Design a binder for this molecule. Structure first.
Ligand SMILES: N#Cc1ccccc1-c1cc(-c2cc(Cl)cc(OCC3CC3)c2)c(=O)n(-c2cccnc2)c1
Ligand SMILES: N#Cc1ccccc1-c1cc(-c2cc(Cl)cc(OCC3CC3)c2)c(=O)n(-c2cccnc2)c1
Lengths: 305, 306
């Protein structure tokens, strides 16, 4: 028993982190097979970042302008190119610690583990969700660019996030590992802002199921509702709409607990309309929305990697 | 910017986790150099859980009664001994992945990362704190015994917790890596209950300092307090007493923010009186107490957002 915000074990990813230095800029890179991946803004001076022409800036660079350090070993760069907003540095040695991996692009509401890194050295791990407004509420300081987010499935690491920028509200923006930004952001030092965010409804429901599994059930009630009626309530309280796909996805938890999704939706409606009566759920006084249905099943069943 | 429950990267500990089996009982062990550490209740049977005599149970075992599996490799046990509530199995192979490490016994209020493991394989990593009542609020299923807690300040793993038991309220009890339990607990299934818990006051103050560092001051006020008056109020809300040691430990955060420690105590007193009035602090609607002053300095910028 117990229920914690839980990250994947990070060892498979720690062996892939390297330091990338270009001129006076140092940040992190991801070393897989014989390529190191990092943000393309590594090649910009601070004045460059105000309005960069990345193709033109990269022409001035040669392989020896990129200093790549894996632990205490220098890696030899033998090629360089861009894919969208990521720089790809070909090196002369394949990473012997490359795990089974793939590159995936996630959707808002999905969660992942972040390995925060500085100067190529892993410093912390925590769990994040891709927000509906395509930001993540991470914890990053200067030097953290190039830190990555990932999920693990059996033996395969699925990389889904590379860190690029901090926005003025203190939330974070980045790309998938093919260099495509999440959200309407660009890698330029210019006026940009997170849009208004919403609450991830299917995840709040998943966490209520986790609460019931862990013996917290004061919010259950005799009522049920319909998808159409509930979605009017969700809209009023700035929650994402609930689809039939979400109901089906909550299947395994609705089986493990034996409570119907629209049954639980009636509980959530009452919590939205009335609040918590000075009570808590799983140690929180807020409705938590960064646990997916799969996260709840994963933690309550003890899956290993 | 940002503030999360941040664990240490777990890879250095993942490389030490093994599976230990004695009889029908399987749990996790920690393989450092040529020794595997695990809870001694691996040698109990279901029948004898209320009052096991561990000395008598162990003398009946030979080395080959312990099966130790590291990945898909069986390790050969060549010796065994008991230290307090931990079994130490000598094996004929030193772990080539042994990190730099030490063993430390921690005080209540200290935090650490937990690598939850089943059958010698890691499941996930999260942050915990040693509660004032010497339990931890973990997330552990059957088979998790022998999972460990640790910090990795600098390049060295300090192991501070090994998981032994789940208590009836759903919280967890265990030992340091010398086998000494935290708190009054014993490794048998006789009736045991966690004592009344309290809130870790010095950690709440550290987390309020983190909030200021990250740019929020709405909860401050114009008042101060004596240390004794603060403790008289705070204890009425089930908070632990704040000592001069705690005031000293908060010094660096006080210096970075320009908020005297006893002025932050006055803010906390008012927060306990008023609640948050629909606001949040660092994403929470409750006063959080599982970040230490050291944790805040580790995670936060050295430059306050003024
Ligand atoms: N690492 C690193 C690093 C090393 C050398 C030089 C710079 C950086 C760097 C750059 C950015 C950045 C980059 C671009 Cl292209 C645009 C941009 O615009 C912000 C404004 C639109 C809102 C910001 C950034 O955000 N950080 C940073 C700081 C703290 C936490 N997370 C990221 C660090
Ligand atoms: N692993 C494993 C394992 C493998 C084979 C057989 C048993 C166990 C086992 C044993 C205990 C335990 C052991 C002793 Cl000696 C006393 C005790 O007393 C509880 C009551 C006094 C309060 C409990 C335990 O708590 N768990 C367990 C379960 C869920 C989460 N965390 C731990 C798992």
């Amino acid at each position: 028993s117990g229920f914690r915000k839980m990250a994947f074990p990070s060892g498979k990813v720690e062996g892939c982190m390297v330091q990338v230095t270009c001129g006076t800029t140092t940040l992190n890179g991801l070393w897989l097979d014989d390529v190191v991946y990092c943000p393309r803004h590594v090649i910009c001076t601070s004045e460059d970042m105000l309005n960069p022409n990345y193709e033109d800036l990269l022409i001035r660079k040669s392989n020896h302008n990129f200093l790549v350090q894996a632990g205490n070993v220098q890696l030899r760069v033998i090629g360089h190119s861009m894919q969208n907003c990521v720089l790809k540095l070909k090196v002369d040695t394949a990473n012997p610690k490359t795990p089974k991996y793939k590159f995936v692009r996630i959707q808002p509401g999905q969660t992942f583990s972040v390995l925060a890194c500085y100067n190529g050295s892993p410093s912390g791990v925590y769990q994040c969700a891709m927000r509906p407004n395509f930001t993540i509420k991470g914890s990053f300081l200067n030097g953290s660019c190039g830190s990555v987010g990932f999920n693990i499935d059996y033996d395969c690491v699925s990389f889904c996030y590379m860190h690029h920028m901090e926005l003025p509200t203190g939330v974070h923006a980045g790309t998938d590992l093919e260099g495509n930004f999440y959200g309407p952001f660009v890698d330029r030092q210019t006026a940009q802002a997170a849009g208004t965010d919403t609450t991830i409804t299917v995840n709040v429901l998943a966490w209520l199921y986790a609460a019931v599994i862990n013996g917290d059930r004061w919010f259950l009630n005799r009522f049920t509702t319909t998808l159409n009626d509930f979605n009017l309530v969700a809209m009023k309280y700035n929650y994402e709409p609930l689809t039939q796909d979400h109901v089906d996805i909550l299947g395994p938890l609705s089986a493990q607990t034996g409570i119907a999704v629209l049954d639980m939706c009636a509980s959530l409606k009452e919590l939205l309309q009335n609040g918590m009566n000075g009570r808590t759920i799983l140690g929180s006084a807020l409705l938590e929305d960064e646990f997916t249905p799969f996260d709840v099943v994963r933690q309550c069943s003890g899956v290993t990697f």
